[model samples]
Target: TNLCPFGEVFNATRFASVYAWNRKRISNCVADYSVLYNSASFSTFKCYGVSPTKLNDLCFTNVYADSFVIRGDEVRQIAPGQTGKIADYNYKLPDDFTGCVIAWNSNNLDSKVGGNYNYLYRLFLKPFERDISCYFPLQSYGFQPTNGVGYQPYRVVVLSFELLHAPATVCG
Candidate 1:
């Protein structure tokens, strides 16, 4: 049963999956993970500034399987296994009347390839009033992990619409 966490404003229903990166030698918490998102979908990945929302981490860091990078509050679609330093561009979220649901895996999760994700969590972060910027989410990041050998391509949607384990406690 996917029970709501202690402090969640809007519940997120699963739809599809995207790619993101996690650095080595860091806590596998949802807060430590960076997401791969575009102002629009089915287009070439681009770079944009942070939304200025209440971000989980002070700044954002992103990387592909090839190299790694960190910026104050920017998003860059670094080409995998290749050098990225092309023209810079910008984008914006849909509008202020929208919230987001971002879910990710741990241990260098690969949305397209393979992974060693021993931990899995889907965090629901939203705002009741006013739209949010990229610096957002974490009303209370829900989390869950199963012990055993690492599994590749785990089910973000184990059952149905918004059905996951309850109890997302912060480990800080």
Candidate 2:
């Protein structure tokens, strides 16, 4: 049985099958993993310089075969390669925050005809909120892997303001 909140779950074995099939069909080509997020119909929560007057508990829902790095009061990194779920009270974002970063396995062709092949596994930021349930690729500011064999594309759906309460300033 699938334990993820998302509609369909692609386990490791299934993913391997799909990956190999696509690779065989198109040599020196990379699969568009973004479709996974698109099909799921997840919502995006764009973060602004300021937050809601009232802060609610953050719920991470519909997280699929990807991992995300959230830097705020502390760094909360969730790896959903083996599994995915709705992390309710278990995880929460700071009332005052910076941004969220996600990685993607993008095709990088040295030449138009594919002379040298490389994959861009890099992190991007929203700086401000854009969408609540989508992967926003921003400036290439963070780490880039020399090798991209082990990276997975990730998407995040935030269930905002479900746990905690707003600050007294807001309530007042």
Candidate 3:
């Protein structure tokens, strides 16, 4: 079973899988990863000389085979190998309700693809809230890899949703 992040707010019974990039070539090449989001952290950022609210969170998910290898808060290398279990997160988001964003890091920067990254994601929400359960569906995003193989960067993909039910509100 996955554990919730130390100090964040989430459904505790839900998780998400998200993949993103900006290269059409990369999307045609491989699949994406999923994370079990356990918390949503908040902060402030400047955009266009103004301060805006941002929300970030932690996800427990996996990396796919036949794609780039992401490591140490950055993309490490592109490999055809797969990892069974991995968890990491980074982001800047809004304070209101919206759709979810799923981001991942890839080393496929030399594919000569202008801009495109395809992702597959899912949300594991509890049955108590909804009639169904399990992986919801896969989501996509576009991202571009900067520099080359020697340069690795971690990407942030986000998805937004309402704080429908906080733990304090759950009937447990």
lDDT of 2 at 2: 21
The candidate, 1 or 2, that scores higher on lDDT is 2
Clashes in candidate 2: how many?
A: 14
Question: What are the lDDT scores of the predictions, listed in order?
Answer: 0.23, 0.25, 0.25
- Give per-residue CA lDDT, model 3, range 1-172, as digits (tens): 2332211222212122222222111111111122223223311111221112322222212211111122223322111132221222211122342333323433343122554433332211211111111644433333345444333333332322223232221010
Span of ten consecutive residues with least summed lDDT in model 3: 23-32
Stretches off by above 4 angstroms in model 1 are 1-93, 101-172
Candidate 3 stretches greater than 4 Å from native: 1-92, 95-102, 109-155, 163-172
User: What does candidate 1's lDDT look like per residue over 48-101, in tens digits?
Assistant: 233313333442222111111112111222222222211111111222211223
Query: Pairing residues by index, what is the TM-score of model 2?
Result: 0.19
Better of 1 and 2 by TM-score: 2
TM-score of each model, in listed order: 0.16, 0.19, 0.19
